[PDB]
Ligand binder design. Structure first.
Ligand SMILES: [Mg+2]
Lengths: 123, 233, 76, 43, 146, 292, 439, 63, 218
């Protein structure tokens, strides 16, 4: 399951402690990380993202609406079941890209609705 | 004045052609000082006979080719550059190689004039296609070092005259390195490793002593000035 | 294979040693115990199954012994 | 090393013995148990 | 040096085998070329050139007139003897134009031959093999602190 | 000399090294001519420690002042007025080097100026009030000692200043072949050199002491520090640069200090340098030396 | 191997030698042996070399980031008080010779020495155990040394022609040993285009099938067209390896050494790289690479380019002075005007530099440096950031070659310091992350 | 529990451990480091450290 | 095409301390290797003619001053480094220097024993005043190269002896150059040898060759 040892170039040996090696392989370049160590730390610590971005709750076409200062996204499920609404999306975050999401685009169960960092707990 | 202890000269034999030589210990920094002069004395200074110019029958204004042989003009010249024969003439002598019919020519088919002796008969020269003949003249003059092909005057009047790069000296490759001894009786002393690949004319030991003498007497020009100051033996 | 000639610690080559044991870790205990075994003899008791070098260190010996397949081992 | 014998087997680090003592002084009862026989004494 | 360039002494060679100028004048320090370009300390190369100027002296540039570069302008600086000391205050120092003009100047070692060109380079002979180094190398005098 | 003149934000009555953020470490526009921006520690003291600038001067109330030359109607006077940071935000500071005209006045059509932003601007000679006393007002003493400073990135310059104060006195103490202004005045103001306080002539010169007979009829003598151990173990040895008959003037330099030669700071030697890479010996910042 | 200061070695091994010189009768009892080592009586040195032989030691440099920050070597007694470190392990240790120090540790028990020789030995750890890429691979000096070796120069001395009419080809050599005799004389250039017969090297794949295909060239002779250096380069690779015949960038060197690890034992790669080192240095010095105010070139188009955007700036600034322009847009515009010009000067600069210049060769070969770096040296350093983190619309028009100005310099440090402060807290946080990953 | 204590929030850890009356099996490698045991990884794994070595009877013959 | 006109080495004169030397002809690509082979040996192995230790009555070590002397003992040792001496040797021999009253001390003031000489008496040692008195003996040994001061804990010396670094190098500065001899080109090299006046460029080059000749063997 682990696969080849990057050092030997062959199947990993049975003694190898790959956790420590993973820890070091990840942290060593951290000095070169200038969207950086804060984002990395954000991921490994599983905190809710800096600017939360919503993910599709279900599959269906998307109805886009622009309020004043906000965005409204509604997913009409292919069920077709209960419509699913995403209430106030600050226009500062814009939207994710396929190009940029537009009214009528289809969406699968996991897709990211807006540029940002999806809450890992939510996914 | 000077006494020091102690240098010695030993040799590891890699092949009948090749030998490695090492001198231990030197006094720092004498490795760099002499070693580069030795690579030169063996390479450029040793008397030996080599081919100078050649002309083939049937090649005059043609660029490269020889009907009846798979080897072309260029391939045969460098094929011939490897010919090793010690000549006693001191003046250019023309040997002759003439052969016909299907067959493979070798350095044994060439008839040396009296005083020139070919040291590598098995040497391959050309492959003769079915029903073919080859005629070649070879100019062999003594010399030293490596003298690139000379067009002087230049090749000039002679039509079909091909000057060739002449490897005059027996030793075709040499290199040196420097390492340090010792166990701290002598700490960081220099050890010189010299790598000599030789042609069958002379052995490595012969080419070393030849360099030794040509270099020793060479420096006699300076020692004759006084002889007062000296060193250890 | 021509790798030229290994000097000191690099002789014998790991690769030729790793064919005599399951892993690099096994190779360590393999040679390591044989070395403690040799040193005892100079005072288990057996070996130097190979011809010792002049001053050769027991660990260096045990590695040569392993290279020549002069000993077998059983993993735990 | 001075007798050229084999290097012996290691013992317990003194710092660890100290740690047990410092935890005891906090009213933490720290026992080192074997598979059994239960409590081992550092001494 | 004063520019932030630092390093340990990795080796010290017999004065016999060192890059040495046509005079037979050995160089004291050999600094690696690679550390220089990426560190933005290039001032250390300037003072290496000026260092050679100040050590060997120089002349104008006159007559008939004063050249275009000296016009902005070195004053009474037109000539300095060998070994004279120079001062380039930080934010008004010598200027690139003025360096080149000085870089050609002045012989001799003793004999009238010149040891450095208008590029601040010279042909060094390896004191090890005795043969020259294939390309012209930058030489000069640098101020280095212990 | 830089240890005095150091100003640090740590200590009792000030912030701790750990708590203060990078806003205090950044250089402010008002540091100009007061606190040298190019000089601080590389460690995690960066920006908390700095050295007072060359022409900077402290106010009886504790605010640093910088010298300026006031300009009136496109003409820079000889009036030199020391201004605090508050009164500098009040006016327009002309750039130190702007072309000078005959008896002096604005030559260049327009003037380089600093605003109260501080935000730089280009306006004609019309609106200026004060001008800079000279380049390197912002610079400190050690910084002002780097020849061709303007060509080196602030990163390597900082390292360069720090390492000058890291040098050690040599037995011989040769002065820099290519220098800057400060070497002369930084050595005398350091106090490690022997200066004469009255004009006169030398009565005696010994390795041990130097006496001068003043024109005043008074007799001054100076005992020489000889092989004195310094705080960190360097050598403070001094040597006389004068001879018996010599005439001398007030404020002149009688004897050299540890790092000085003939009155100017000598922190090192002038060496013949070759910038070629050499047989993998000087590599990765390593250096090779003549056994000479 | 590593250079170990003999004084340091003596103390490290003290109990070992104390025994040895009691075994040999140099000292009658252990007490005498101890004094003999302390006073450093000359007999001990020969003894030290005995005990230290094939007895490994661990070398560490702090901070230790990956396990490669500790490696075992074969100690060699060295004069002086410094430590001689092989130049190919700098990468792993991140070792600067600016005055870094390193710790030495002496493994004692048989198991510890085994772990050193087998697990931690220098030559058995080559590839990074993260990306698998090679680490001990040549770098810096060794790049430019080989890059120069393998490069091909149009119209160098001895260039094969090939001859026509009255002359034969003229670019041909009996053997590589001949092209050397020609190179030592002024005849041949190492970077020349000549073709040669090679008995002892191995041709490529395609040219292998067409020439032999029986078949192979174990002792056989064959001819290809390459630079003399490219020949000597391939004499460094294993005899079994095919003939590359390229000029070696760093990446090209990475390709090959990556390939040696897949197809060959480690010992082979260990020795191959050792030979790349020796060659790369010899030719890095013969490379003729230096730096000078002269070798720093500036594009002449910089002036016009500079004043070209000066108008666009003062005009867009003229549009803001008119009052219509949005202040944030005018400043923002100055960023795009100047940011763009910085590329043109980069484009213009790159276009100016002759390909053999010493400054560009360093960056081209991948040894060290950037173009962004060589853009601030000559041309323009470009826009710089205020401490607030924004972009100061005032560009630095001068380059560090012409020198910056009082205000140009005061502005640069504004940002340049904030970066050096970052580098401080980037190791403090990165290490705090690594400690959590590890746990 | 002693692995957690050495990591962070030592006081919080020790207090919860003493109340839960926690027993640490000393399986992990950090625990074995602290007490000076052989970490259960690499050469310290059972299969490797229990290796038994003897020369082949064929080898002893050649002596 | 053997060209044998045996090498010719003809002397020259430039100054009294240095003289050019020329050797022609030589096979192509020689003078460099042959020139540097002499320069390397000249800058090192020419014997001396150097001063080992010194003793000064008043001072027990290097780091003090002397009453009335302008130079401290260490700055005086530095000066005495520039001494260029020459000695028939063998075995160590002490020189002597004593000077009183004001003046300037120089190498001329050094009284050499029988069999040694000081070749630059013009050299400044120390400047003395009315109270200055300098009594110092110097030990001249014979050898070659550069030998760092031998500490008297290693030698048998007592607390009084000041060991000093010794430079035995008759030769001062050395260079060379070559000119080929067009086809048929040979090589002729000129070497420029300068000495410190302890020996003539002739005698040193003779030393080098003599030392260089004896070394080549086979
Ligand atoms: Mg460092």
């Amino acid at each position: 399951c682990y696969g080849r040892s990057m050092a030997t170039g062959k199947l990993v040996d049975i003694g190898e402690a790959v956790g420590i090696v993973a820890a070091q392989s990840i942290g060593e370049p951290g000095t070169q990380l200038t969207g950086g160590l804060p984002r990395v730390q954000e991921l490994f610590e599983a905190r809710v993202p800096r600017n939360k971005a919503p993910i599709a709750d279900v599959a269906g076409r998307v109805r886009l609406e622009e309020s004043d200062k906000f965005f409204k996204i509604t997913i009409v499920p292919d069920d077709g079941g209960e419509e699913v609404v995403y209430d106030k999306l600050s226009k500062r975050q814009r939207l994710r890209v396929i190009g940029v999401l537009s009214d009528g685009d289809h969406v699968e169960v996991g897709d990211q609705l807006m540029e940002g960092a999806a809450d890992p707990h939510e996914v | 004045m000077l006494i020091s202890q102690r240098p010695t000269l030993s040799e590891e034999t890699v092949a009948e052609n090749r030998s490695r030589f090492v001198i231990e210990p030197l006094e720092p920094g004498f490795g760099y000082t002499l070693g580069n002069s030795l690579r030169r004395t063996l390479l450029s200074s040793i008397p030996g006979a080599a081919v100078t110019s050649i002309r083939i029958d049937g090649v005059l204004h043609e660029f490269t080719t020889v009907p009846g042989v798979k080897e072309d003009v260029t391939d045969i010249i460098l094929n011939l550059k490897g010919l090793v024969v010690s000549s006693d003439d001191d003046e250019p002598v023309t040997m002759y190689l003439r052969k016909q019919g299907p067959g493979v020519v070798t350095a044994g088919d060439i008839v040396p004039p009296a005083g020139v002796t070919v040291h590598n008969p098995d040497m391959h020269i050309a492959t003769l296609n079915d029903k073919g003949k080859l005629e070649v003249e070879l100019v062999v003059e003594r010399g030293r070092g490596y003298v690139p092909a000379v067009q002087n005057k230049a090749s000039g009047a002679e039509i079909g005259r091909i000057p060739v790069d002449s490897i005059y000296s027996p030793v075709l490759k040499v290199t040196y390195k420097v390492e340090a001894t010792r166990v701290e009786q002598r700490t960081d002393f220099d050890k010189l490793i010299i790598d000599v690949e030789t042609k069958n004319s002379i052995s490595p030991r012969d080419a070393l002593a030849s360099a030794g003498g040509t270099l020793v007497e060479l420096f006699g020009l300076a020692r004759e000035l006084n002889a007062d100051s000296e060193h250890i033996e | 294979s021509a790798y030229d000639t290994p000097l000191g610690i690099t002789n014998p080559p790991i690769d030729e040693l790793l064919s005599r044991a399951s892993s690099k870790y096994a190779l360590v205990i393999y040679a390591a115990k044989r070395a403690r075994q040799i040193n005892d003899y100079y005072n288990e008791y057996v070996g130097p199954l190979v011809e010792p070098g002049l001053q050769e260190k027991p660990l260096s010996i045990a590695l040569r012994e392993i290279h020549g397949d002069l000993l077998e081992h059983t993993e735990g | 090393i001075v007798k050229g014998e084999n290097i012996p087997e290691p013992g317990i680090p003194e710092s660890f013995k100290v740690l047990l003592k410092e935890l005891q002084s906090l009213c933490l009862n720290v026992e080192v148990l074997s598979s059994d026989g239960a409590a081992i004494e550092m001494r | 040096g004063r520019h932030g360039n630092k390093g340990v002494i990795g080796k010290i060679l017999p004065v016999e085998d060192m890059p040495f100028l046509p005079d037979g004048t050995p160089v004291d320090i050999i600094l690696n070329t690679h550390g220089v370009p990426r560190r933005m300390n290039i001032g250390q190369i300037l003072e290496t050139h000026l260092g050679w100027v100040a050590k060997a002296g120089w002349n104008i540039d006159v007559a008939a007139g004063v050249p275009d570069w000296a016009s902005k302008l070195p004053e009474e600086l037109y000539s300095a003897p060998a070994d004279s000391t120079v001062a380039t205050p930080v934010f008004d120092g010598a200027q690139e134009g003025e360096l080149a003009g000085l870089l050609g100047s002045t012989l001799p070692n003793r004999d009238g031959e010149v040891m450095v060109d208008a590029d601040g380079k010279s042909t060094l002979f390896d004191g090890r093999s005795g043969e020259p180094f294939p390309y012209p190398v930058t030489v000069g005098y640098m101020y280095i602190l212990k | 000399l830089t240890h005095k003149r150091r100003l640090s934000a740590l200590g009792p009555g000030g912030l701790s090294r750990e708590r203060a953020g990078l806003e205090v470490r950044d250089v402010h526009p008002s540091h100009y001519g007061r606190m040298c921006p190019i000089e601080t520690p590389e460690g995690p003291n960066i920006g908390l420690i700095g050295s007072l600038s060359v022409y900077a001067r402290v106010n009886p109330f504790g605010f640093i002042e910088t010298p300026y030359r006031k300009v009136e109607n496109g003409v820079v006077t000889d009036q030199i007025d020391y201004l605090t940071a508050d009164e500098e935000d009040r006016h327009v500071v002309a750039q130190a080097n702007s072309p000078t005209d005959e008896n002096g006045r604005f030559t260049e059509d327009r003037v380089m100026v600093r605003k109260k932003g501080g935000e730089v601007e280009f306006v004609s000679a019309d609106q200026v009030d004060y001008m800079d006393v000279s380049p390197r007002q912002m610079v400190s003493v050690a910084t002002a000692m780097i020849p061709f400073l303007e060509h080196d990135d602030a990163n390597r310059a900082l390292m360069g200043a720090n390492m000058q104060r890291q040098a050690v006195p040599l037995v011989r103490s040769e002065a820099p072949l290519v220098g800057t202004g400060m070497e002369l005045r930084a050595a005398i103001d350091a106090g490690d050199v022997v200066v004469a306080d009255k004009t006169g002539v030398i009565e005696e010169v010994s390795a041990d002491y130097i006496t001068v007979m003043a024109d005043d009829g008074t007799r001054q003598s100076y005992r020489l520090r000889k092989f004195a151990r310094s705080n960190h173990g360097t050598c403070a040895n001094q040597r006389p640069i004068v001879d018996a008959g010599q005439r001398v003037e007030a404020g002149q330099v009688i004897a050299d200090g540890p790092c000085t030669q003939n009155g100017e700071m000598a922190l090192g030697k002038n060496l013949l340098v070759a910038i070629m890479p050499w047989e993998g010996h000087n590599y990765e910042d390593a250096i090779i030396l003549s056994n000479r | 191997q590593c250079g170990l200061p003999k004084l340091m070695a003596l103390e490290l091994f003290k109990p070992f030698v104390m025994k040895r010189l009691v075994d040999l009768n140099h000292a009658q009892n252990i007490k005498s042996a101890k004094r003999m080592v302390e006073r450093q009586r000359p007999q001990v040195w020969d003894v030290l070399e005995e005990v230290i032989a094939e007895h490994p030691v661990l070398l560490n440099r702090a901070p230790t980031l990956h396990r490669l920050g500790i490696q075992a070597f074969e100690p060699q007694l060295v004069e002086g008080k410094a430590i001689q470190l092989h130049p190919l392990v700098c990468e792993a240790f991140n070792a600067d010779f600016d005055g870094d120090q390193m710790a030495v540790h002496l493994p004692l028990s048989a198991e510890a020495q085994a772990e050193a020789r087998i697990l931690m030995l220098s030559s058995n750890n080559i590839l990074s155990p993260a990306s698998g890429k090679p680490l001990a691979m040549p770098r810096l000096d060794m790049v430019t040394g080989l890059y120069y070796l393998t490069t091909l120069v149009e119209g160098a001395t001895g260039e094969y022609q090939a001859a026509t009419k009255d002359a034969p080809e003229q670019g041909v050599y009996s053997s590589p040993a001949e092209a050397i005799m020609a190179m030592d004389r002024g005849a041949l250039s190492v970077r020349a285009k000549i073709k040669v017969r090679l008995t002892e090297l191995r041709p490529p794949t395609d040219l292998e099938a067409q020439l032999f295909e029986n078949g192979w060239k174990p002792g056989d002779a064959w001819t290809a067209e390459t630079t003399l250096g490219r020949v000597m380069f391939n004499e460094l690779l294993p005899k079994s390896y095919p003939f590359v015949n390229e000029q070696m960038h760093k990446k090209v060197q990475a390709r090959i050494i990556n390939d040696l690890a897949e197809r060959f034992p480690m010992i082979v790669v260990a020795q191959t790289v050792d030979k790349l080192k020796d060659a790369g240095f010899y030719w890095a010095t013969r490379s003729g690479v230096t730096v000078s105010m002269a070798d720093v070139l500036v594009p002449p188009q910089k002036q016009e380019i500079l004043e070209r955007h000066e108008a666009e700036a003062d005009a867009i600034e003229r549009k803001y002075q008119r009052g219509a322009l949005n202040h944030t847009e005018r400043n923002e515009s100055l960023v795009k005007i100047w940011q763009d010009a910085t590329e043109e000067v980069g484009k213009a600069l790159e276009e100016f530099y002759p390909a053999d210049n010493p400054i560009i060769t360093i960056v081209k070969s991948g040894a060290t440096g950037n173009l962004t770096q060589t853009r601030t040296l000559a041309g323009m350093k470009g826009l710089v950031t205020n401490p607030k983190g924004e972009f100061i619309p005032r560009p630095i028009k001068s380059s560090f070659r012409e020198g910056l100005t009082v205000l140009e310099y005061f502005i640069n440090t504004h940002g340049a310091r904030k970066g050096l402060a970052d580098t401080a807290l980037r190791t403090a946080d990165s290490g705090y992350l690594t400690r959590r990953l590890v746990d | 529990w002693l692995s957690a204590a050495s990591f962070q929030e030592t006081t919080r850890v020790l207090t919860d451990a003493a109340i839960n009356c926690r027993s640490d099996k000393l399986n992990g490698l950090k625990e074995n480091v602290i007490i000076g045991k052989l970490i259960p990884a690499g050469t310290g794994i059972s299969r490797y450290r229990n290796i038994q070595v003897q020369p082949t009877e064929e080898a002893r013959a050649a002596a």
